[PDB]
Amino acid sequence: GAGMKAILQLILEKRQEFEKLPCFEFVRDETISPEERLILYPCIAAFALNFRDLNRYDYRDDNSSDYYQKIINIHTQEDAKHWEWFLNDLELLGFDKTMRFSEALRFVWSDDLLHTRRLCHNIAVLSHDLEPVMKMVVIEAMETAGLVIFHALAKPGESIAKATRRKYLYVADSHVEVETGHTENIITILEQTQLSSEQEEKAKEIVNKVFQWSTNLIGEFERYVKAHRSEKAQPTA
Amino acid sequence: GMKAILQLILEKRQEFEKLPCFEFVRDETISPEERLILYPCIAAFALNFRDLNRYDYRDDNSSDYYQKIINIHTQEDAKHWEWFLNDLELLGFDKTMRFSEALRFVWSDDLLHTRRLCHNIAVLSHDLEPVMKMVVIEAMETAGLVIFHALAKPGESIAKATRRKYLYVADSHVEVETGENIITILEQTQLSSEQEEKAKEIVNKVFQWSTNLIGEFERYVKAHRSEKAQPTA
Ligand SMILES: N[C@@H](Cc1c[nH]c2ccccc12)C(=O)O
Ligand SMILES: N[C@@H](Cc1c[nH]c2ccccc12)C(=O)O
Ligand SMILES: [Fe+2]
Ligand SMILES: [Fe+2]
Ligand code: NI
Ligand code: NI
Ligand code: NI
Ligand code: NI
Ligand code: NI
């Protein structure tokens, strides 16, 4: 229908806005050392394990016989493994520092990482009463934002991986490629689905919110970078 | 109506109070440092509870009478996370560790129910009218008073033995938590049939999620029997 085609087109329009945010200009700027462009990496601590939990406990319904939910379960199973990759690159980048337990807690629950820490919370709340087809729209919008972020972060990440001869897993092309997926992708199923008028309206609200919340997270990354521009990652060769 | 909902909260409290974790915590034949082995588990909850109170309960864009008094109470409850960080240091649990060891601790599969308690309350609360939010908050505060009445027993024993001011596992926390109140307003309120059935669901959920957290605290103590508090004189 024109319903589903309007939804997928809205995700494209939001993606095109989202790709142009200042953070991503900065992350992509090869005239700044990759070490300085990845100074935002530790901020991901407020999101990456929350995302694991979103996939394990909010998206997944192991019991459902529903066609759409079974496809979600398969995809979420894989997407919930990426937090280990985050902790891998956290160490390689020199950001796995020894600190007091309270300093780690005060960092994650920083007022400067509120939108970062609440992105998966907001998605869980949006998703609580959605039928599987509508969760698929949530996941497609959220994955579209994710691919923009990690396509950008993989640029300095692959520069450091090549130079230090270390295998990066999270800020790395392998993450982008595995995430994109190539049994069927959600975007294939969505292209074969028609939405009611209510569903079409709910899908608009979903795409708008997922992109607004993702932009709020990126906003906090930009302000963290501004506060740390004299600092850099310290990868070991 | 309400009377039935206030009576279920007291029934749930009397059941909750009997959990094996609370018998362990109140056992004065066990050193208080051993009974507060569970204290660092509170890291997965205390700052989430701050956020629940700042962001999920509170609505700074409402004019409703019930929502106004909620906002007031959530203001005070949102300050106790600093007391948690105070007592963490006093008990010798503010350990130097890798950032990743802190993250792997809070996001432990053994603290799933502890970490998801506030999340579960936010999902439960997000579409509730304010009177029903008051029911969530009253049940939650009833469960919290059982826990902190028990924790303050070994807390105040260490506080006196070491002459340090404890703030979280301490009588002062139990006293300000308790001290117009929400219960006053609920006693004077008439629940429709539909609100009555939902208030029942809220009170059952708040106490089941709280029991699940307490279960994880008990399993933690058994899996870390060495890692007793190390307060200093
Ligand atoms: N790929 C990310 C998850 C992710 C999906 N969508 C996002 C949007 C914003 C930030 C992160 C994400 C990870 O493995 O952790
Ligand atoms: N008083 C607790 C909060 C609390 C209320 N109800 C609870 C139930 C379980 C655990 C904690 C709580 C604090 O300041 O952190
Ligand atoms: Fe990922
Ligand atoms: Fe409290
Ligand atoms: Ni996938
Ligand atoms: Ni392939
Ligand atoms: Ni109060
Ligand atoms: Ni809702
Ligand atoms: Ni352990």
Numbering used by the authors:
A (entry chain A): -2 to 179, 183 to 237
B (entry chain B): 0 to 178, 184 to 237
Sentences from the paper on this structure:
The biosynthesis of neurotoxin aetokthonotoxin (AETX) that features a unique structure of pentabrominated biindole nitrile involves a first-of-its-kind nitrile synthase termed AetD, an enzyme that shares very low sequence identity to known structures and catalyzes an unprecedented mechanism. AetD adopts the heme oxygenase like fold and forms a hydrophobic cavity within a helical bundle to accommodate the indole moiety.
Notably, we demonstrate that the AetD-catalyzed reaction is independent of the bromination of the substrate and also solved crystal structures of AetD in complex with 5-Br-L-Trp and L-Trp. We also solved the crystal structure of AetD in complex with 2 and 3, which reveal that these compounds bind in the pocket as that was observed in AetD/1/Fe. In addition, the structures of these complex crystals without soaking with Fe ion were also solved. These complexes harbor the same metal ion coordination statuses as that was observed in the AetD/1 structure, which provide additional evidences to support the conclusions regarding the formation of the diiron cluster in AetD/Fe complex crystals. Notably, 2 lacks the S214-mediated interaction and 3 forms even fewer contacts to the enzyme in comparison with 1 and 2. This could be one factor accounting for the lower transformation efficacy of 3.
